[PDB]
Coordinates of C-alpha atoms in Angstrom, one line a residue:
Chain H
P113 CA 57.3 -58.4 -35.7
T114 CA 57.2 -61.4 -33.3
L115 CA 56.3 -60.6 -29.7
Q116 CA 59.3 -61.8 -27.6
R117 CA 58.6 -60.1 -24.3
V118 CA 55.6 -58.7 -22.5
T119 CA 55.6 -56.1 -19.8
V120 CA 53.1 -57.0 -17.1
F121 CA 51.4 -54.8 -14.5
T122 CA 49.5 -56.4 -11.7
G123 CA 48.7 -56.1 -8.0
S124 CA 51.0 -56.7 -5.1
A125 CA 47.9 -58.2 -3.5
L126 CA 46.5 -61.7 -4.4
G127 CA 42.8 -60.7 -4.4
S128 CA 39.7 -62.0 -2.6
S129 CA 39.4 -65.2 -4.7
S130 CA 42.0 -67.7 -5.9
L131 CA 40.6 -67.1 -9.4
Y132 CA 43.1 -64.2 -10.0
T133 CA 46.1 -66.5 -9.2
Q134 CA 44.7 -69.1 -11.6
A135 CA 44.1 -66.6 -14.4
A136 CA 47.8 -65.4 -13.9
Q137 CA 49.2 -68.9 -14.1
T138 CA 47.3 -69.8 -17.2
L139 CA 48.4 -66.5 -18.8
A140 CA 52.0 -67.3 -18.0
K141 CA 51.8 -70.9 -19.4
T142 CA 50.2 -69.7 -22.6
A143 CA 52.8 -67.0 -23.0
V144 CA 55.6 -69.5 -22.4
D145 CA 54.1 -72.0 -24.9
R146 CA 54.0 -69.0 -27.5
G147 CA 57.7 -68.2 -26.9
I148 CA 57.1 -65.0 -24.9
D149 CA 59.1 -63.9 -21.8
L150 CA 58.1 -61.7 -18.9
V151 CA 59.2 -58.2 -18.0
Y152 CA 57.7 -56.9 -14.8
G153 CA 58.6 -54.9 -11.7
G154 CA 60.6 -57.5 -9.8
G155 CA 58.4 -58.2 -6.8
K156 CA 57.7 -61.4 -4.9
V157 CA 54.3 -60.8 -3.2
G158 CA 50.8 -60.9 -4.6
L159 CA 50.0 -61.5 -8.2
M160 CA 53.4 -60.1 -9.1
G161 CA 55.1 -63.1 -7.4
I162 CA 52.5 -65.5 -8.8
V163 CA 53.0 -64.4 -12.4
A164 CA 56.8 -64.4 -12.3
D165 CA 57.0 -67.8 -10.6
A166 CA 54.5 -69.0 -13.2
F167 CA 56.6 -68.0 -16.1
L168 CA 59.7 -69.6 -14.5
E169 CA 58.0 -72.8 -13.4
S170 CA 56.6 -73.1 -17.0
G171 CA 60.2 -73.0 -18.1
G172 CA 60.2 -69.4 -19.4
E173 CA 62.3 -66.3 -18.4
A174 CA 61.4 -63.5 -16.1
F175 CA 63.1 -60.1 -16.1
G176 CA 62.6 -57.8 -13.1
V177 CA 63.2 -54.1 -12.9
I178 CA 63.4 -52.4 -9.6
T179 CA 64.7 -49.2 -7.9
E180 CA 67.5 -49.1 -5.5
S181 CA 65.1 -48.1 -2.6
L182 CA 62.7 -51.0 -3.2
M183 CA 65.7 -53.4 -3.2
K184 CA 67.0 -52.1 0.2
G185 CA 63.5 -52.8 1.6
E186 CA 64.0 -56.5 0.7
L187 CA 61.1 -56.3 -1.9
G188 CA 63.1 -58.0 -4.8
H189 CA 62.5 -61.4 -6.1
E190 CA 65.6 -63.7 -5.7
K191 CA 65.3 -66.4 -8.4
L192 CA 64.6 -64.3 -11.6
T193 CA 66.5 -64.8 -14.8
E194 CA 67.6 -61.2 -14.1
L195 CA 66.9 -58.5 -11.7
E196 CA 67.9 -55.0 -13.0
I197 CA 68.5 -52.4 -10.2
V198 CA 68.1 -48.8 -11.5
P199 CA 68.5 -45.5 -9.6
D200 CA 64.9 -44.2 -9.6
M201 CA 61.2 -44.9 -10.6
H202 CA 61.4 -42.7 -13.8
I203 CA 64.2 -45.0 -15.0
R204 CA 62.4 -48.1 -13.8
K205 CA 59.2 -47.4 -15.7
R206 CA 61.0 -46.4 -18.9
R207 CA 63.2 -49.6 -18.7
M208 CA 60.1 -51.7 -18.2
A209 CA 58.6 -50.1 -21.4
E210 CA 61.8 -50.5 -23.4
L211 CA 62.2 -54.2 -22.5
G212 CA 58.7 -55.2 -23.5
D213 CA 57.1 -55.6 -26.9
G214 CA 53.6 -54.9 -25.5
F215 CA 51.9 -54.3 -22.2
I216 CA 49.5 -56.4 -20.2
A217 CA 47.4 -55.1 -17.3
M218 CA 46.1 -57.8 -15.0
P219 CA 44.0 -57.2 -11.9
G220 CA 45.6 -54.8 -9.3
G221 CA 45.2 -51.7 -7.2
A222 CA 46.3 -48.1 -7.4
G223 CA 49.8 -49.0 -8.7
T224 CA 48.6 -51.0 -11.6
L225 CA 46.3 -48.3 -12.7
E226 CA 49.0 -45.7 -12.4
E227 CA 51.3 -47.8 -14.6
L228 CA 48.6 -48.3 -17.1
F229 CA 47.7 -44.6 -17.2
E230 CA 51.3 -43.7 -17.6
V231 CA 51.7 -45.8 -20.8
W232 CA 48.4 -44.2 -22.1
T233 CA 49.8 -40.8 -21.3
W234 CA 53.0 -41.6 -23.2
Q235 CA 51.0 -42.8 -26.2
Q236 CA 49.0 -39.5 -26.4
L237 CA 52.5 -37.9 -26.6
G238 CA 53.8 -40.2 -29.5
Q239 CA 53.5 -47.2 -29.7
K240 CA 53.2 -50.8 -28.6
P241 CA 50.0 -52.8 -27.9
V242 CA 48.3 -52.6 -24.5
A243 CA 45.9 -55.4 -23.4
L244 CA 43.7 -55.5 -20.4
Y245 CA 43.4 -59.1 -19.1
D246 CA 39.7 -58.8 -18.2
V247 CA 39.7 -61.7 -15.6
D248 CA 36.1 -62.0 -14.3
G249 CA 35.2 -58.6 -16.0
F250 CA 37.8 -56.8 -13.8
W251 CA 38.4 -54.1 -16.3
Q252 CA 34.7 -53.4 -17.2
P253 CA 34.1 -50.5 -14.9
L254 CA 37.3 -48.9 -16.3
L255 CA 36.1 -49.3 -19.9
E256 CA 32.9 -47.5 -18.8
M257 CA 35.0 -44.6 -17.4
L258 CA 37.0 -44.5 -20.6
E259 CA 34.0 -44.5 -22.8
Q260 CA 32.5 -41.8 -20.7
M261 CA 35.7 -39.8 -21.0
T262 CA 35.5 -40.2 -24.8
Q263 CA 31.8 -39.0 -25.0
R264 CA 32.8 -36.0 -22.9
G265 CA 35.6 -35.2 -25.3
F266 CA 38.6 -35.8 -23.0
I267 CA 40.0 -38.8 -25.0
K268 CA 39.9 -39.3 -28.8
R269 CA 37.7 -42.0 -30.3
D270 CA 40.9 -43.4 -31.8
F271 CA 41.7 -44.9 -28.3
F272 CA 39.3 -47.8 -28.9
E273 CA 40.8 -48.6 -32.3
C274 CA 44.1 -49.5 -30.6
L275 CA 43.1 -51.1 -27.3
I276 CA 43.0 -54.9 -26.6
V277 CA 40.5 -56.2 -24.0
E278 CA 40.3 -60.0 -23.5
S279 CA 39.4 -62.4 -20.7
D280 CA 40.9 -65.4 -22.5
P281 CA 44.7 -65.7 -22.4
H282 CA 45.2 -67.5 -25.8
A283 CA 43.1 -64.8 -27.4
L284 CA 44.6 -61.9 -25.4
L285 CA 48.1 -62.9 -26.7
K286 CA 47.1 -63.7 -30.3
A287 CA 45.6 -60.2 -30.5
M288 CA 48.8 -58.5 -29.3
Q289 CA 50.6 -60.4 -32.1
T290 CA 48.1 -59.6 -34.8
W291 CA 47.8 -56.0 -33.6
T292 CA 46.3 -53.9 -36.5
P293 CA 46.2 -50.3 -35.0
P294 CA 45.7 -47.1 -37.2
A295 CA 48.8 -45.7 -38.9
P296 CA 50.7 -42.9 -36.9
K297 CA 49.5 -40.0 -39.2
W298 CA 45.9 -40.9 -38.1
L299 CA 46.9 -40.8 -34.3
Chain O
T196 CA 55.6 -18.8 10.6
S197 CA 56.9 -21.2 13.1
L198 CA 58.5 -24.4 11.9
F199 CA 56.2 -26.4 14.4
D200 CA 52.9 -24.8 13.0
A201 CA 50.8 -27.5 11.4
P202 CA 50.3 -27.1 7.6
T203 CA 47.3 -25.2 6.1
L204 CA 45.7 -25.1 2.7
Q205 CA 47.5 -22.2 1.0
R206 CA 48.0 -23.9 -2.4
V207 CA 46.1 -26.5 -4.3
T208 CA 47.8 -28.6 -7.0
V209 CA 45.3 -29.1 -9.8
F210 CA 45.2 -31.9 -12.3
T211 CA 43.0 -31.3 -15.4
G212 CA 42.7 -31.9 -19.1
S213 CA 44.5 -30.2 -22.0
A214 CA 41.2 -30.5 -23.8
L215 CA 38.1 -28.3 -22.9
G216 CA 35.7 -31.2 -23.3
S217 CA 32.5 -31.4 -25.3
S218 CA 30.5 -28.9 -23.2
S219 CA 31.1 -25.4 -21.7
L220 CA 30.0 -26.7 -18.3
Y221 CA 33.6 -27.9 -17.6
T222 CA 35.0 -24.5 -18.3
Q223 CA 32.5 -22.7 -16.2
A224 CA 33.0 -25.3 -13.4
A225 CA 36.7 -24.6 -13.5
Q226 CA 36.1 -20.8 -13.3
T227 CA 33.8 -21.1 -10.3
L228 CA 36.3 -23.3 -8.7
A229 CA 39.2 -20.8 -9.3
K230 CA 37.1 -17.9 -7.9
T231 CA 36.1 -19.8 -4.7
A232 CA 39.7 -20.7 -4.1
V233 CA 41.1 -17.2 -4.6
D234 CA 38.3 -15.8 -2.4
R235 CA 39.6 -18.0 0.4
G236 CA 43.2 -16.9 -0.2
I237 CA 44.1 -20.1 -2.0
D238 CA 46.6 -20.2 -5.0
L239 CA 47.1 -22.6 -8.0
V240 CA 49.9 -25.0 -8.6
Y241 CA 49.4 -26.8 -12.0
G242 CA 51.3 -28.3 -14.9
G243 CA 51.8 -25.0 -16.8
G244 CA 49.7 -25.4 -20.0
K245 CA 47.7 -22.8 -21.9
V246 CA 45.1 -25.1 -23.6
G247 CA 42.0 -26.8 -22.4
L248 CA 40.9 -26.6 -18.8
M249 CA 44.6 -26.2 -17.8
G250 CA 44.5 -22.8 -19.6
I251 CA 41.0 -22.0 -18.3
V252 CA 41.8 -22.7 -14.6
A253 CA 45.2 -20.8 -14.8
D254 CA 43.5 -17.8 -16.4
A255 CA 40.6 -17.8 -13.9
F256 CA 42.9 -17.8 -10.8
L257 CA 44.9 -15.0 -12.4
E258 CA 41.9 -13.0 -13.5
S259 CA 40.3 -13.2 -10.0
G260 CA 43.4 -11.7 -8.3
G261 CA 45.3 -14.9 -7.4
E262 CA 48.7 -16.3 -8.3
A263 CA 49.1 -19.3 -10.5
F264 CA 52.3 -21.4 -10.4
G265 CA 53.2 -23.7 -13.3
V266 CA 55.6 -26.7 -13.4
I267 CA 56.6 -27.8 -16.9
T268 CA 59.5 -29.7 -18.6
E269 CA 62.0 -28.6 -21.2
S270 CA 60.4 -31.1 -23.7
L271 CA 56.9 -29.7 -23.4
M272 CA 58.3 -26.2 -23.3
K273 CA 60.2 -26.6 -26.6
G274 CA 56.8 -27.7 -27.8
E275 CA 55.5 -24.1 -27.4
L276 CA 53.0 -25.4 -24.8
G277 CA 53.9 -23.2 -21.7
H278 CA 51.6 -20.5 -20.4
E279 CA 53.1 -17.0 -20.8
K280 CA 51.5 -14.9 -18.0
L281 CA 51.7 -17.0 -14.8
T282 CA 53.1 -15.7 -11.6
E283 CA 55.8 -18.2 -12.2
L284 CA 56.6 -21.0 -14.7
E285 CA 59.2 -23.5 -13.4
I286 CA 61.0 -25.5 -16.1
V287 CA 62.5 -28.8 -14.8
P288 CA 64.6 -31.4 -16.6
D289 CA 62.0 -34.2 -16.8
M290 CA 58.5 -35.4 -16.0
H291 CA 59.5 -37.2 -12.8
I292 CA 60.8 -33.9 -11.4
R293 CA 57.8 -32.1 -12.7
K294 CA 55.4 -34.4 -10.6
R295 CA 57.5 -34.3 -7.5
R296 CA 57.6 -30.5 -7.6
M297 CA 53.8 -30.2 -8.2
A298 CA 53.3 -32.4 -5.1
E299 CA 55.9 -30.5 -3.0
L300 CA 54.4 -27.1 -3.8
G301 CA 50.8 -27.9 -3.1
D302 CA 49.1 -28.4 0.2
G303 CA 46.4 -30.5 -1.4
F304 CA 45.3 -32.0 -4.7
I305 CA 42.2 -31.6 -6.9
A306 CA 41.5 -33.7 -10.0
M307 CA 39.1 -32.0 -12.4
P308 CA 37.8 -33.6 -15.6
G309 CA 40.6 -34.6 -18.0
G310 CA 42.2 -37.4 -19.9
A311 CA 44.9 -40.0 -19.3
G312 CA 47.4 -37.5 -18.0
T313 CA 45.0 -36.3 -15.4
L314 CA 44.1 -39.9 -14.3
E315 CA 47.7 -40.8 -14.2
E316 CA 48.6 -37.9 -11.9
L317 CA 45.7 -38.8 -9.6
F318 CA 46.7 -42.5 -9.2
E319 CA 50.3 -41.3 -8.7
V320 CA 49.4 -39.3 -5.6
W321 CA 47.4 -42.2 -4.3
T322 CA 50.2 -44.7 -4.9
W323 CA 52.3 -42.2 -2.8
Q324 CA 49.6 -41.6 -0.1
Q325 CA 49.5 -45.3 0.9
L326 CA 53.3 -45.4 1.4
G327 CA 53.0 -42.2 3.6
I328 CA 55.3 -40.0 1.5
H329 CA 52.7 -37.3 2.0
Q330 CA 49.3 -37.0 3.8
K331 CA 47.5 -34.3 2.0
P332 CA 43.8 -34.2 1.0
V333 CA 42.9 -35.5 -2.5
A334 CA 39.6 -34.2 -3.9
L335 CA 37.7 -35.2 -7.0
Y336 CA 35.8 -32.3 -8.5
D337 CA 32.8 -34.2 -9.7
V338 CA 31.5 -31.9 -12.5
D339 CA 28.4 -33.6 -13.9
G340 CA 29.2 -36.8 -12.2
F341 CA 32.5 -37.1 -14.1
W342 CA 34.2 -39.2 -11.5
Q343 CA 31.3 -41.5 -10.8
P344 CA 32.5 -44.4 -13.1
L345 CA 36.0 -44.3 -11.5
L346 CA 34.5 -44.5 -8.1
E347 CA 32.6 -47.6 -9.2
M348 CA 35.9 -49.1 -10.4
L349 CA 37.5 -48.3 -7.1
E350 CA 34.6 -49.7 -5.1
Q351 CA 35.0 -52.9 -7.2
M352 CA 38.7 -53.1 -6.7
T353 CA 38.1 -52.7 -2.9
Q354 CA 35.6 -55.6 -3.0
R355 CA 37.9 -57.9 -5.0
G356 CA 40.7 -57.3 -2.3
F357 CA 43.2 -55.1 -4.3
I358 CA 42.7 -51.8 -2.3
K359 CA 42.0 -51.4 1.4
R360 CA 38.5 -50.0 2.3
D361 CA 40.3 -47.8 4.8
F362 CA 42.3 -46.0 2.1
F363 CA 39.4 -45.4 -0.3
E364 CA 37.2 -43.6 2.3
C365 CA 39.1 -40.4 3.2
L366 CA 38.7 -39.3 -0.4
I367 CA 36.9 -36.0 -1.0
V368 CA 34.3 -36.1 -3.8
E369 CA 32.2 -33.0 -4.6
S370 CA 30.4 -31.4 -7.5
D371 CA 30.1 -28.1 -5.6
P372 CA 33.3 -26.0 -5.3
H373 CA 32.4 -24.5 -2.0
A374 CA 31.8 -28.0 -0.6
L375 CA 35.1 -29.2 -2.2
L376 CA 37.4 -26.5 -0.8
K377 CA 35.6 -26.5 2.5
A378 CA 36.2 -30.3 2.9
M379 CA 40.0 -29.8 1.9
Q380 CA 40.3 -26.9 4.5
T381 CA 38.8 -28.9 7.4
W382 CA 40.4 -32.3 6.5
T383 CA 42.9 -34.2 8.7
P384 CA 44.6 -37.6 8.7

């Protein structure tokens, strides 16, 4: 059905170039023009803050999910549509997954990769689209790692028949909406 | 031993695939790694499986005279997936607790070839390392240059300003098991 929310993973740093910020803002505008809200981890620094603000300033809604510990460290964004506090990181990540209709990974560090690998681990274990927003070819070295992992027999070929990889935000989001994966019995 | 003694490398927590991979090299590399570790008095903490390189590495520590500790969840256990001849198999309520326990039990971390689960565990300990919740050596067992493309990825992430060059560079990467364990034994923060 209609994508209503996307769950977004992205760095708590801005990056070396203002191009990451701009790719985030554009992605948010595009999503908000398509009727799509933001679910994310409730931060205010780096690309996390940039994308949440972008959704809000574009006139959309932004839903944050954060742990009680992160909140007490003052890490929580204070003008979201809603900030859910949950007791621990297991709950946080599962809640982020339940709220979204799909996942988008933008540029980030260790944390973003962890989140992304976590959803891929859950999908091995039995189902929503995952898109890599390939801003400036950011995700290309990862796709090479993943292809190498498939050739070496550690991931099934079927991985590539489900994955979305796009550098253009209009096309990234349209592809999540028209997501034609293989039927569960093949996975 | 004294509560003020500094830690040593008595256990390694190993992350690895529930597949064997498309060549026997991975299996043999796991066995050579297990033997080296046991010969140095080092034991296995791992996720408790009996298939793929998980099964191989567990079996090889056992069959060389070492102990192997597994940490698994009720879910995966009801799945018939637990190994049945470990020194101990700990069943915990959820996957969160599983990963916390694997970290707590090990004095260091090795990531061998594997899939998404293995990668996730590796990025999990890193995400923890750079908030200081532990400072334990993390080693990539580079069987046939397996980890080389991820290192490229990480190098690029460091150039684009998303990871600190400081953090990246205390990472052990070795194809040779001797060199890998040696580096983890002599490592400090």
